[PDB]
Amino acid sequence: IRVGGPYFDDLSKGQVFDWAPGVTLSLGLAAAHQSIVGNRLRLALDSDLCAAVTGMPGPLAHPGLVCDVAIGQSTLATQRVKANLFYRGLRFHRFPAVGDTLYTRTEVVGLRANSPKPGRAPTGLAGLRMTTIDRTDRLVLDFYRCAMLPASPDWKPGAVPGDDLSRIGADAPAPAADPTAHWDGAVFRKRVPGPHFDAGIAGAVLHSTADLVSGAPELARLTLNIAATHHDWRVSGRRLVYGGHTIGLALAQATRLLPNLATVLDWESCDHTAPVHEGDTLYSELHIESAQAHADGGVLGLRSLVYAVSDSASEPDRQVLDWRFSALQF
Amino acid sequence: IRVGGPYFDDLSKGQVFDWAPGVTLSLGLAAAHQSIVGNRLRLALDSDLCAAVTGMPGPLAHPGLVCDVAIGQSTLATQRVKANLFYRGLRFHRFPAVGDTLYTRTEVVGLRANSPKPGRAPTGLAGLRMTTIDRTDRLVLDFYRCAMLPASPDWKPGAVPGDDLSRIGADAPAPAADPTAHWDGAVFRKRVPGPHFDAGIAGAVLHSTADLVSGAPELARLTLNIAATHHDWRVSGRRLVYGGHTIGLALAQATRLLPNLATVLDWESCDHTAPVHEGDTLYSELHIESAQAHADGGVLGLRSLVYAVSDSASEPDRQVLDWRFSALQF
Amino acid sequence: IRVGGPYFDDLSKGQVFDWAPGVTLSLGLAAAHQSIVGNRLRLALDSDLCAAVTGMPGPLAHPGLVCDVAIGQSTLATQRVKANLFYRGLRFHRFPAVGDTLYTRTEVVGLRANSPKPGRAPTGLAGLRMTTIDRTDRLVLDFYRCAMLPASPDWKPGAVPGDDLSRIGADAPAPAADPTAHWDGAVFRKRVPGPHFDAGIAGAVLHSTADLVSGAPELARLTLNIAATHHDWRVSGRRLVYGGHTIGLALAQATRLLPNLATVLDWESCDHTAPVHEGDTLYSELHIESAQAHADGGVLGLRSLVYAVSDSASEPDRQVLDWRFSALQF
Ligand SMILES: [Cl-]
Ligand SMILES: [Cl-]
Ligand SMILES: [Cl-]
């Protein structure tokens, strides 16, 4: 594989990138991740509660950390990325503990050359499937993204890698088993102040407080993310903040709004609406789209619109991200 | 409780905020804390010495980390804070180990509406008592602060929450037991180069080297501190640095000056003299006000004046903080 | 020893600074270090692979972290430093595990007053020997640096500390034993995708992707580095980035280029060509100078030229560092 990463025309449908380092989750990584994007997930902060609830071999790896590690691992293929158009179908098949080691395979699922346009660099889109497992060979995540890559300088433009990429990561199999089935919602309800799960909150629209985007290159280094645009301002003209950082702050915002979320069960990004830069201040509008009771608590469906604060009272704030996720709540 | 935190007129004398997440202290949190404010406390850095000295179930949680976690926990009540006028009566009742989990209760002890003043936002002061315990229900900290909060937009100003707040956190009970009684000062003296404790140093006035204020929002995220002014520049016009960060650097300064301090036993802030901002460079003048011999070493009483460096040789530096603490020294 | 550190004329040939705190290596420190300079060393990231390969009592402390801690420890003597002219003869005598504690002795090996020059501050050079051991008294590192220090304000200039410093840290004893002799290269080759060691790569010249210099004061605080120029802009006029940070990014660059390096065996800096500042963007030219087969894999000799990116397409990039190291590769 080329130094600096593949160009679009270096890739093939079915090609596999599996030489990414394994990464052992530690409370070290957890703390650094928390200092950058925040962490108010009670099971990820309190080991005694985590043990009472999950009985887990160790404390709960923050789900945003697990996702960020899997996505940063996969950037071997996409060091040359100009933009990811979406992340899709992240659903946890299990929730790793601190001390578990994650290994991520990246497969090219589909390739489509972009139509030539005057003044634009030749580029194509790569549909990528990431499969993240642990040392026990159990599936953790199996998810998709759509990466725009430049073609090599002498590439002969044409149409023919021309895969249909529209439906990438759909009808994707649900997990074999409920990843929280062994979690005891009853001790959570007893030890954590309510309100606990209530299907009556569906429909609510909440407005978060703001966070600063800072430590963005640190988050990328922490999670092995080597997409050049996060590190090197000359790729896009300014460094572009990793999508997961913006998502991470939006999740922290949602958790200040809804302090009793147990975990994130699945998520995807709907629109990366505008670029985010280091030093931006973000807030979100949180829609509770659905609330479904289960035998033990229930599951909220959330949709988060994230905005960057403009530099004055006389300039409108701008939408930068639209994403959606589901969360378990006891 | 209101989204975004209570206004001054949402509070009541005797009201309790106890739904803050528990936080398990980890060497992860310790390392992140150290990268932001520094750490030269020998018992917090060296696990072998810590074990020889304290015999402790695990290594020594840096006392500034423990305080910062307890204060960040308590910011649930004070997300809307305009200023804390002081922190008072922090005295450790025990020194938690890595792996211990901290839980903090915040009680409204007193409320006083501020007198209307033309051009100023309607506000009041809240005297707050924080009680921090571990999972074993043992008292760790029991301390006070005075927070200024805005009143809600339609509040009818008056005098009557009008509690006398002047003496908040005084005649506060000393710990039941000496929190360092089981620490072996003799192995410390044998293994660490002197000078060791000497009552003759009382009266000394020392001048520190400088530190940069950086990673301020990170320290806040790390310690669950969600006071909006640390994150959102539009609350005050610029983000204001958390008081504990400034104190943390002043403590690091004192520990470079006095490398053999065993721990901080108690502390309080005397005047938050001027705001501190990210990118400020601070130094301190350290007064050793008292030095009292005990059966095993002694206790220093310290008073620290902290200054921000101006941007030229022809502009005076400005005092930003005056605080005082006591430290055990073998 | 003087508050703020010794001046050049405070030092003596044979003087010893051994009151630096011991520092226990933790996965906390490892994570913070990784967030600042990156970490792609497979044995430092993956505990399961580390155990299979080394059998080690715990996971592998990143070698750049170990070096940075030893060098930051030693800054007690050099708080007043104006420049280190080189670091020399770092060779690992063993590779510490997480949980091991490092203790560093700094000895003045040689002193040479600099010749007076009009308009320049009076200064001298100190040749320093650092010896880093663990709690088991085993040698970890035994290395050298050349620090330029100011003389005190009333110093009487002369020639006589006038030691010959040119050959400091040469003919330095190789380790008693191969520090990786018990590492199993065969399981590494089986579990990590090739290419594995190939003497045929000697001669290659590779060009890295770029990294941002950020969190520089954090790296210094993390590793107990109290050289004032890293913290206080008024010493040099701007804060100067610690040499180890630049080296750390150059090593991260080399590891993206050569993803299967097992560890760094030794290193030294050849020229600190120009200052580096926070916010610089760096890339490197990596020369594989030598490749020598051993019974288990082989050892690469690398020379790294590091450059700072200029602020436009019409300004040349500038060399900031030239260093060289050797690495084991299975
Ligand atoms: Cl373009
Ligand atoms: Cl006002
Ligand atoms: Cl000069």
Please check whether residue B74 is in contact with residue B106, taking contact to mean a CB–CB distance below 8 angstroms. Answer: yes
Q: Which of C153, C175, C204 is the last residue of a domain?
A: C153
Q: Whole-angstrom Cα distance, residue A277 to residue A279?
A: 6
Measured between CA atoms, how close is B298 to chain C, in angstroms?
Answer: 20
Q: Which helix (H) or strand (E) holds C254?
A: helix C243-257
B134 → chain A, closest CA residue: A48
The verdict on residue C22 lying in a domain is yes
A119 lies in the same domain as A233 = no
Q: Whole-angstrom Cα distance, residue B245 to residue B282?
A: 11
Helix extents (H) in chain B: 27-37, 42-45, 47-54, 63-73, 185-191, 216-222, 243-257
Please check whether residue C214 is in contact with residue A217, taking contact to mean a CB–CB distance below 8 angstroms. Answer: yes
The verdict on residue C100 lying in a domain is yes
B220 → chain A, closest CA residue: A35
Residue A275, chain C, CB below 8 Å: the answer is: no
Rounded to 10°, the helix B27-37/B63-73 angle is 100
Could you tell me the CA-to-CA distances from A171 to A130, A174, C304 in Å, in that order?
Answer: 16, 9, 49
Answer yes or no: do C34 and A219 touch at CB < 8 A. no
Could you tell me the CA-to-CA distances from B172 to B63, B90, B91, B165 in Å, in that order?
Answer: 20, 10, 10, 15
The verdict on residue A158 lying in a domain is no
Interface of B with C in 152-191 (CB under 8 A): none
C312 lies in the same domain as C197 = yes
- Please tell me the distance between residue C119's alpha carbon and the centre of ligand 3 in angstroms: 7
Closest CA to A277 of A222, A217, A326: A217
CA angle centred on B69, ends B63 and B74, rounded to 5°: 130
B121 lies in the same domain as B256 = no
Residue B46, chain C, CB below 8 Å: the answer is: yes
Quickly tell me which residue has 């409320």 as its tokens: B111
Two structure tokens written together for A31: 């703390």
Radius of gyration of chain B (CA): 20
Closest CA to C241 of C257, C229, C251: C229
CA angle centred on A143, ends A140 and A146, rounded to 5°: 155
Q: Which amino acid does the sequence have at A37?
A: V
Which of the other chains make 3 or more beta carbon contacts under 8 angstroms with chain B? A, C
Helix extents (H) in A25-116: 27-37, 42-45, 47-54, 63-73
Closest CA to A219 of A102, A65, A74: A65
B192 lies in the same domain as B327 = yes
- Please tell me the distance between residue C13's alpha carbon and the centre of ligand 3 in angstroms: 25
Answer yes or no: do C21 and B32 touch at CB < 8 A. no
A129 lies in the same domain as A193 = no
Answer yes or no: do A24 and C46 touch at CB < 8 A. yes
Please check whether residue C285 is in contact with residue C206, taking contact to mean a CB–CB distance below 8 angstroms. Answer: yes
Residue A129, chain B, CB below 8 Å: the answer is: no
B219: left (phi over 0), alpha (psi -120 to 50) or beta: alpha
Quickly tell me which residue has 């509406």 as its tokens: B113
Domain count, chain A: 2
Please check whether residue B51 is in contact with residue B98, taking contact to mean a CB–CB distance below 8 angstroms. Answer: no
Answer yes or no: do C231 and B212 touch at CB < 8 A. yes
The verdict on residue C160 lying in a domain is no
The verdict on residue A164 lying in a domain is no
Answer yes or no: do A226 and C209 touch at CB < 8 A. yes
Please check whether residue A318 is in contact with residue A307, taking contact to mean a CB–CB distance below 8 angstroms. Answer: yes
- Please tell me the distance between residue A72's alpha carbon and the centre of ligand 1 in angstroms: 24
Q: Select from B32, B135, B232 the Cβ nearest to the Cβ of A210.
A: B232
Residue C133, chain B, CB below 8 Å: the answer is: no
A2 lies in the same domain as A127 = yes
Could you tell me which residues come within 8 angstroms of residue B303 by beta carbon, excluding any fewer than 6 positions away? B270, B286, B287, B289, B322, B323, B324
Q: Which helix (H) or strand (E) holds C271?
A: strand C263-272
- Please tell me the distance between residue A226's alpha carbon and the centre of ligand 1 in angstroms: 20
Please check whether residue B330 is in contact with residue B262, taking contact to mean a CB–CB distance below 8 angstroms. Answer: yes
Q: Whole-angstrom Cα distance, residue B113 to residue C258?
A: 65
Interface test with C, best of A218, A245, A278 (most C CBs within 10 A): A218
Residue B257, chain A, CB below 8 Å: the answer is: no
A191 → chain B, closest CA residue: B19
What are the chain B neighbours of C18 within 8 Å (beta carbons)?
A: 193
Measured between CA atoms, how close is A196 to chain C, in angstroms?
Answer: 34
Alpha carbon of residue B58 to chain centroid: 23
The verdict on residue C167 lying in a domain is no
Beta bridge partners of C113: C124
Q: Whole-angstrom Cα distance, residue C54 to residue C47?
A: 10
**At B137, is the secondary structure helix, strand, or coil?**
coil
CA angle centred on A278, ends A275 and A284, rounded to 5°: 60
Please check whether residue B110 is in contact with residue B165, taking contact to mean a CB–CB distance below 8 angstroms. Answer: yes
Residue B277, chain C, CB below 8 Å: the answer is: no
B105 lies in the same domain as B244 = no
Could you tell me which residues come within 8 angstroms of residue A213 by beta carbon, excluding any fewer than 6 positions away? A241, A245, A246, A249, A276, A277, A278, A279, A280, A281, A282
A36 → chain C, closest CA residue: C35
Nearest bound ligand to the CA of residue A118: 1
Could you tell me which residues come within 8 angstroms of residue C216 by beta carbon, excluding any fewer than 6 positions away? C36, C230, C239, C241, C242, C245, C278
Resolution of the model in angstroms: 1.9
The verdict on residue C13 lying in a domain is yes
The verdict on residue A305 lying in a domain is yes
What are the chain C neighbours of B259 within 8 Å (beta carbons)?
A: 19, 21
Q: Which of B135, B153, B171 is the last residue of a domain?
A: B153
Q: Which of C99, C131, C153 is the last residue of a domain?
A: C153
Respond yes or no on whether the N-terminal peptide bond of residue B195 is cis (omega within 30° of 0). yes
Measured between CA atoms, how close is C71 to chain B, in angstroms?
Answer: 15
B149 lies in the same domain as B4 = yes
Residue C1, chain B, CB below 8 Å: the answer is: no
Answer yes or no: do C29 and A31 touch at CB < 8 A. no
Domain that holds residue A264: 184-330
Q: What are phi and psi of B216, to 5 degrees?
A: -65, -45
Rounded to 10°, the helix B243-257/B63-73 angle is 170
Answer yes or no: do B40 and C23 touch at CB < 8 A. no
C189 lies in the same domain as C142 = no
CA angle centred on A230, ends A224 and A234, rounded to 5°: 135
Q: Which helix (H) or strand (E) holds C143?
A: strand C139-150
Q: Whole-angstrom Cα distance, residue C275 to residue B42?
A: 32
Answer yes or no: do B28 and C24 touch at CB < 8 A. no
Residues in chain C: 330
- Please tell me the distance between residue C314's alpha carbon and the centre of ligand 1 in angstroms: 20
Provide the CATH number for the domain around residue A43.
3.10.129.10
- For A4-39, letters b (16+ CB in 10 Å) and e give bbbbbbbbeeebebeebbbbbbbbbbbbbbbbbbbb
Answer yes or no: do B46 and C24 touch at CB < 8 A. yes
Closest CA to A127 of A173, A164, A90, A76: A164
C196 lies in the same domain as C259 = yes
- Experimental technique used? X-ray
Answer yes or no: do C211 and A231 touch at CB < 8 A. yes
Residue B89, chain C, CB below 8 Å: the answer is: no
Two structure tokens written together for C291: 């490749």
Which of the other chains make 3 or more beta carbon contacts under 8 angstroms with chain C? A, B
Q: Whole-angstrom Cα distance, residue B300 to residue A306?
A: 50
B140 lies in the same domain as B195 = no
Strand B123-133 relative to strand A83-88: parallel, antiparallel, unpaired? unpaired
Two structure tokens written together for A289: 């789209």
Q: Which helix (H) or strand (E) holds C188?
A: helix C185-191
Q: Whole-angstrom Cα distance, residue A242 to residue A229?
A: 9
Please check whether residue B63 is in contact with residue B263, taking contact to mean a CB–CB distance below 8 angstroms. Answer: yes
Dihedral sign from CA coordinates of C108, C110, C116, C118: negative
Could you tell me which residues come within 8 angstroms of residue C283 by beta carbon, excluding any fewer than 6 positions away? C207, C208, C209, C210, C211, C253, C306, C307, C309, C317
B198 lies in the same domain as B149 = no
